[PDB]
Design an enzyme around this catalytic site. Structure first.
Site, PDB file in Angstrom:
ATOM      1  N   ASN D 290      44.745  46.912  42.856  1.00 44.38           N
ATOM      2  CA  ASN D 290      43.460  47.231  43.471  1.00 44.38           C
ATOM      3  C   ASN D 290      43.342  46.391  44.734  1.00 44.38           C
ATOM      4  O   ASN D 290      42.686  45.346  44.742  1.00 44.38           O
ATOM      5  CB  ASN D 290      42.312  46.957  42.507  1.00 44.38           C
ATOM      6  CG  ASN D 290      42.238  47.972  41.391  1.00 44.38           C
ATOM      7  OD1 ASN D 290      42.349  49.175  41.623  1.00 44.38           O
ATOM      8  ND2 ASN D 290      42.064  47.493  40.168  1.00 44.38           N
ATOM      9  N   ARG D 292      41.797  45.263  47.041  1.00 49.07           N
ATOM     10  CA  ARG D 292      40.427  45.037  47.482  1.00 49.07           C
ATOM     11  C   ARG D 292      39.899  43.844  46.696  1.00 49.07           C
ATOM     12  O   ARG D 292      40.664  43.138  46.028  1.00 49.07           O
ATOM     13  CB  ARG D 292      39.567  46.285  47.279  1.00 49.07           C
ATOM     14  CG  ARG D 292      39.760  46.941  45.927  1.00 49.07           C
ATOM     15  CD  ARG D 292      38.599  47.848  45.589  1.00 49.07           C
ATOM     16  NE  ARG D 292      38.916  48.733  44.477  1.00 49.07           N
ATOM     17  CZ  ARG D 292      39.016  48.346  43.214  1.00 49.07           C
ATOM     18  NH1 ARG D 292      38.841  47.085  42.863  1.00 49.07           N
ATOM     19  NH2 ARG D 292      39.309  49.246  42.281  1.00 49.07           N
ATOM     20  N   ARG D 338      28.469  44.409  32.671  1.00 48.64           N
ATOM     21  CA  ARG D 338      27.839  45.304  33.624  1.00 48.64           C
ATOM     22  C   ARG D 338      26.614  45.976  33.018  1.00 48.64           C
ATOM     23  O   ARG D 338      26.549  46.209  31.810  1.00 48.64           O
ATOM     24  CB  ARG D 338      28.837  46.364  34.079  1.00 48.64           C
ATOM     25  CG  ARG D 338      30.111  45.777  34.651  1.00 48.64           C
ATOM     26  CD  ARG D 338      31.130  46.850  34.962  1.00 48.64           C
ATOM     27  NE  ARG D 338      32.359  46.281  35.497  1.00 48.64           N
ATOM     28  CZ  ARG D 338      33.341  46.992  36.030  1.00 48.64           C
ATOM     29  NH1 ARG D 338      33.267  48.307  36.129  1.00 48.64           N
ATOM     30  NH2 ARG D 338      34.426  46.365  36.474  1.00 48.64           N
TER      31      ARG D 338
END
Ligand code: ACO
Ligand code: ADP
Ligand code: BTN
Ligand code: MG
Ligand code: ZN
EC number: 6.3.4.14
Lengths: 77, 284, 316, 449, 57
Positions: D290, D292, D338
């Protein structure tokens, strides 16, 4: 009345060239088909055409003042 | 309380400089584009997939393999004798177009190779006075056809013109017959001649060799016909059908074989020619 | 959608479908699917032979019109590769009742011309029930000439109810176009092979069927006139179509003895529709075999043989 | 330091980046959509620009409008964040060439590593172990496809190399539907992500999601921070992520970290990125990168003490790494949870207005979000509305705090996944720590009569 | 009968390639196979007035 708004983001110019007459000016009314301003973006000086024929009541922006999406530009009554 | 702010305006003094030639536009849909992206997607707006103009040399390079390119008929240049006196002088437009486009005439010819198979290609630079079929255009066409005949190899071309070169008057018109004779001389041999139509394909070029090759491949949304839409509009004094003279319409009306988008083109020509010439299929 | 006489096959199929659902439908239902599937498939396989053993010419016609079957598109997909469809007569329109193109057969390049009835109602009306207006046959002539020019063999499939009986079709020289087609195809310098897949005949079918070899499936009818037409004109009725079919001799084996067709390609059981892949493989093998023993002859000898075979037509 | 940057994103990551920027004294520019006019990060920013209408494609993916904003305001870089234009290599190319600085990796590695199969190939070349599979994009040689399937071992999974967001993946039970499954997976990839590339990779039945965070300045320096573990997932979407991971002895930590650092050096990696993995029986099998800043970045920040966004903004300013590999320490244990606007069971987004809201606070509890009273959740983008944390000196303490914080937390007006978080926290196996990725999927259960 | 159309077409082609004209004069009725075989194929196609010519009845 109606307010026409920039559909893109970029520098706001009214005179197409550095030393040029403004496409439109307060007072004189416009028609549906006519360029009202220039919204430069990446040196590609685009143009904005009205959609409702009416008087140019006022101009809510000034040349050289960046504008955003849906930024109100001119109000037509 | 930040939850309720003033909605301030931006300061005009701030100023950043972007390079001029890195961002282009597609008037068909209006989406600004990254010039290198458009140029890498063969001048095809990836947003609305609307084909645009391409340079003749760029087109020839795109199709042909690299390092095998060989231009033909490069010594042929306009030699106006009709001294046509228009609002401008025909020599004026000749020189202006020649310097603006960097090419002697509308047509460019470059012998080359496709996936290891010899071939001759060509194309029209529509920017050149509407890409009209001038004397040099027909002469280069004859040169290419002669090259194809002497060396057994399919000959391909792309169509882009607004009509025959008026300023040369009947000299251009006659070229249609010259091109037709050359194309007949080749078809009788067994060498295929595929002509791929691109907007605009109109007037003399359309009716001379644009529609004459074994196959007639019209790139989408291209304007193909004989008489310009303005002329037909004034003549019939009515509303033309939607999609008039459009490849998506001239495949409906039988005149157009198959609609090919530019990216496939080189494979589409390579596969079809490797079939017809009876050669083994190309390797992706 | 199986035919009327394929009912016992149907109901057994109808029980078979919900087996998938019962696998994971609801209430933890996951039954011993394999045992029931095996038994029901055994019964279905046994029953189809009990159903397709006793079909005759009137049925053959019904099977030739089974509304679940491979059309020329299907045989192209399942036996041909690198297929390029050329559409356009160059005169007035391209026709959807005929589909032509240039493709490869085991590396070799070929031309494929044939009809396409469309699968469902929409593609049936868009293709005019495989009924070609003449512009289609002009297109077929154009393609056949192209194939002849570049020393290329021609493979043709024939699946048409007939040339369209309509104002537009008659106005544009239907008779003229078919006459020309029948004239040119008899002079090409390249071998020609033509099957009779599906339902074909009524003359217009012959527009693309004049070749060195002719082949037909086991359930394909090739009649100068549909059975219903013959019934109406002669029997003075329509219900008596089966008698017309029996009399005419529209079934492949009946035609085979007539020296009219050169081979019959056997079908998968229950009709080619049950195993389209097997039918495609059989067709590809037959086509390749036909081409093989054909390429030995030279072009002049090819045309001479073609002419001689034509003259054998008719007992006279 | 960068004189100004644009937050080319929205929400939790947007607000977090805004905090990091203001910390480092780098002025901020908030590019918002017309529906996201009253976001927190928007209102707390120096200069706000509207680039398009509510939909993602018209407004936030409108790369032209974002570059327009960046040019008019005078920025000298942009932060994309994660999501929207995170991995769009072409966006990176355009931002690089337009005249601004792309905060993150150079577009070249975006292209190399955004293609899963090329990523795995380069990893194999660099010494990173990889899952058995095709070792190349799937062609139309069904014979070869089934040969490879037999070689790796059934069952198998089809994954679009250009796919994202846990979609466009299908499990193949056998060759019976291999062709149709492949065709429909390719069709879905074409429809959504415009890319058809599909590849075959072995299927594992007992994985423990791992991912090791790495920082490299692109100048030959690449370091590896603490580990992670996102084991809990629903529909392959993470819910709970613990960092570090239970049972990862420092030997394995350093062993895999050194290889990942060498890989970052070889690729010449720039910016913050994370090498996902898969774990079982003391083995690692790379599965993606990923390239990022991930979503569960905090759970490495609180155990390492290093602010990742600040490290990124320093690298983008040209500063090399200011933290050595040895000086990086993992002191304790974390957990993250989350909060999403979905129905607690149906998993249907339920956007609306939040009448009442109350942060947890308390020691060790970190609340990242933008929501607040009167904030009408826009029914127009992802369903995340907060990344809550609870740092403890051990897993027991961290879970305990989480339980307490979730007790305190009130979010009213829109249904949310708090009940599920409490239930997971109370789960015995989860409290033990070390469940397989499926754990939550298996608890879901099946039909009942 | 149907096959005869091809035989006639082949013969007519064999003759046209020679240079011998083949004029076919249509008279009512000229329909179906005959119309589409050699009725419409000769160099000239001379239709006697008010005659019924076509393909489908
Ligand atoms: C009778 C003939 O064969 S020539 C008659 C002219 N052509 C036609 O009637 C057919 C099509 N007619 C046309 O006007 C165009 O070709 C169309 C319809 C395709 C429109 O394409 P457009 O985008 O409008 O291109 P346009 O006509 O402006 O062509 C570009 C330039 O080529 C010029 N040009 C095009 N064809 C010719 C030609 N045959 N002779 C001379 N100049 C020509 C135009 O004058 C124009 O020059 P300018 O821009 O400096 O004024
Ligand atoms: N080869 C595999 N075997 C088993 N599970 C896998 C495999 N590849 C991916 N997965 C599951 O899917 C999740 C996401 O995979 P990833 O490749 O990171 O896709 P995405 O790009 O959608 O995040 C992994 O965390 C894992 O749980
Ligand atoms: C490029 O130098 C960025 C600044 C924009 C220059 C152009 S010249 C035309 C417009 N007039 C003006 O004052 N500036 C605009
Ligand atoms: Mg992932
Ligand atoms: Zn466009």
């Amino acid at each position: 009345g109606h307010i026409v708004r920039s559909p893109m983001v970029g520098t706001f110019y009214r005179t197409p060239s550095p030393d040029a007459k403004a496409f439109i000016e307060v007072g004189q009314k416009v028609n549906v088909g006519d360029t009202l301003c220039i919204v430069e973006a990446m040196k590609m000086m685009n143009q904005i055409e009205a959609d409702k024929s009416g008087t140019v009541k006022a101009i809510l922006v000034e040349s050289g003042q960046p504008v955003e999406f849906d930024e109100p530009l001119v109000v037509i009554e | 309380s930040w939850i309720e702010r003033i909605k301030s305006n931006i300061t005009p003094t701030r100023k950043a400089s972007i390079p001029e030639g890195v961002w282009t536009k597609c008037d068909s849909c209006g989406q600004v584009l990254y010039r290198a992206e458009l140029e890498r997607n063969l001048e095809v707006c990836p947003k609305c997939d609307h084909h645009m103009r391409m340079t003749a040399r760029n087109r020839l390079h795109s199709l042909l393999d690299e390092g095998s390119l060989v231009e033909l008929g490069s010594e042929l240049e306009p030699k106006d004798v009709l001294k046509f006196r228009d609002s401008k002088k025909y020599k004026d437009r000749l020189a202006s177009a020649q310097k603006e486009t960097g090419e002697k005439d509308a047509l460019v010819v470059m012998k080359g190779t496709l996936y290891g198979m010899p071939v001759v290609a060509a194309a029209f630079e529509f920017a050149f006075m509407g890409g009209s079929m001038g004397s040099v255009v027909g002469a280069r066409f004859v040169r290419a056809v002669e090259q194809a005949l002497e060396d057994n190899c399919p000959l391909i071309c792309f169509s882009a013109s607004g009509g025959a070169r008026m300023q040369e008057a009947l000299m251009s018109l006659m070229q249609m017959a010259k091109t037709s004779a050359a194309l007949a001389k080749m078809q009788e041999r067994g060498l295929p001649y595929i002509s791929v139509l691109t907007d605009p394909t109109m007037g003399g070029v359309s009716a001379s060799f644009a529609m004459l090759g074994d196959l007639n491949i019209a790139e989408p949304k291209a304007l193909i016909g004989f008489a310009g839409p303005r002329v037909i509009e004034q003549t019939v004094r009515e509303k033309l059908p939607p999609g008039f003279q459009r490849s998506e319409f001239l495949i409906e009306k039988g005149a157009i074989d198959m609609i090919v988008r530019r990216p496939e083109m080189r494979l589409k020509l390579a596969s079809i020619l490797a079939k017809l010439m009876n050669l083994p299929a190309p390797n992706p | 959608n199986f035919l009327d006489f394929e009912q016992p096959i149907a109901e057994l199929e109808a029980k078979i479908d919900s087996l998938t659902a019962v696998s994971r439908q609801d209430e933890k239902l996951d039954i011993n699917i394999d045992e029931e599937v095996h038994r029901l498939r055994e019964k279905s396989v046994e029953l189809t032979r009990k159903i397709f053993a006793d079909l005759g010419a009137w049925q053959i016609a019904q099977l030739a019109r089974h509304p679940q079957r491979p059309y020329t598109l299907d045989y192209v997909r399942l036996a041909f590769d690198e297929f390029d469809e050329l559409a356009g007569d160059r005169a007035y329109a391209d026709d959807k009742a005929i589909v032509g193109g240039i493709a490869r057969l085991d590396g070799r390049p070929v031309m494929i011309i044939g009809h396409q009835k469309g699968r469902e109602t929409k593609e049936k009306i868009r293709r005019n029930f495989g009924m070609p207006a003449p512009e289609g046959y002009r297109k077929a002539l154009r393609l056949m000439q192209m194939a002849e020019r570049f020393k290329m063999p021609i493979i043709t499939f024939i699946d048409t109810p007939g040339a369209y009986p309509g104002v537009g079709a008659e106005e544009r020289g239907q008779s003229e176009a078919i006459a020309r087609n029948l004239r040119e195809m008899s002079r090409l310098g390249v071998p020609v092979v033509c099957t009779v897949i599906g339902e074909g005949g009524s003359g217009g079918a012959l527009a693309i069927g004049v070749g060195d070899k002719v082949n037909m499936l086991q359930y394909s009818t090739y009649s100068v006139i549909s059975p219903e037409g013959c019934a109406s004109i002669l029997w003075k009725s329509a219900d008596k179509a089966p008698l017309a079919a029996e009399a005419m001799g529209i079934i492949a084996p009946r035609l085979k003895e007539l020296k009219l067709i050169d081979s019959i390609i056997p079908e998968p059981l229950g009709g080619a529709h049950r195993n389209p892949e097997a039918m495609a493989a059989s067709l590809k093998a037959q086509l390749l075999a036909d081409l093989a023993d054909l390429d030995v002859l030279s072009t002049e000898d090819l045309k001479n043989r073609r002419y001689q075979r034509l003259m054998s037509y008719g007992y006279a | 330091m960068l004189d100004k940057i644009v937050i080319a994103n929205r929400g939790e990551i947007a607000l977090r980046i805004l905090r990091a920027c203001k910390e480092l004294g780098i002025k901020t520019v908030a590019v918002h959509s017309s529906a996201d006019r009253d976001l927190k990060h928007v209102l707390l920013a120096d200069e706000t620009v509207c680039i398009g209408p509510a939909p993602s494609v018209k407004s936030y993916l409108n790369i032209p409008a974002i570059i327009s904003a960046a040019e008019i305001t005078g920025a000298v870089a942009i932060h994309p964040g994660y999501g929207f234009l995170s991995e769009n290599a072409n966006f990176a190319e355009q931002v690089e060439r337009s005249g601004f600085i792309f905060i993150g990796p150079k577009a070249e590695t975006i292209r190399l590593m955004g293609d899963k199969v090329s990523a795995i190939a380069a990893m194999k070349k660099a010494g990173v172990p990889c899952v058995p599979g095709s070792d190349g994009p799937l062609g139309d040689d069904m014979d070869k496809n089934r040969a490879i399937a037999k070689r790796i071992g059934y069952p198998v999974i089809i994954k679009a190399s250009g796919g994202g967001g846990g979609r466009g993946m299908r499990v193949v039970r056998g060759d019976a539907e291999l062709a149709q499954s492949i065709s429909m997976t390719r069709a879905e990839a074409k429809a959504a992500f415009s890319n058809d590339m599909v590849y075959m990779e072995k299927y594992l039945e007992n994985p423990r999601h791992v991912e090791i965070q790495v920082l490299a300045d692109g100048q030959g320096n690449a370091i590896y921070l603490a580990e992670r573990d996102c084991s809990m997932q629903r529909r392959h979407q993470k819910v709970v992520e613990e960092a570090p991971a239970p049972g990862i002895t420092p030997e394995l930590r350093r062993y895999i970290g050194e290889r990942c650092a060498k890989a970052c050096v070889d690729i010449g990696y720039r910016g913050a990125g994370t090498f996902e993995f898969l774990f079982e029986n003391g083995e690692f099998y790379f599965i993606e990168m990923n390239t990022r800043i991930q979503v569960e970045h905090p759970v490495t920040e609180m155990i390492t003490g290093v602010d990742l966004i600040k490290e990124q903004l320093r690298i983008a300013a040209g500063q090399p790494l200011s933290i050595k590999q040895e000086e990086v320490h993992v002191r304790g244990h974390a957990v993250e949870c989350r909060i999403n606007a979905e129905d607690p069971n149906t998993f249907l987004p339920s956007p609306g207005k939040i009448t009442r809201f109350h942060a947890p606070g308390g020691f060790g509890v970190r609340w990242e979000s933008h929501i607040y009273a009167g904030y009408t959740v826009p029914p127009y983008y992802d369903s995340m509305i907060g990344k809550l944390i609870c740092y403890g000196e051990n897993r027991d303490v961290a879970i305990a705090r989480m339980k307490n914080a979730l007790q305190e937390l009130i979010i009213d007006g829109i249904k949310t996944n708090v009940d599920l978080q409490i239930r997971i926290m109370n789960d015995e196996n989860f409290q033990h720590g070390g469940t397989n990725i499926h754990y939550l999927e298996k608890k879901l259960g099946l039909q009942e009569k």
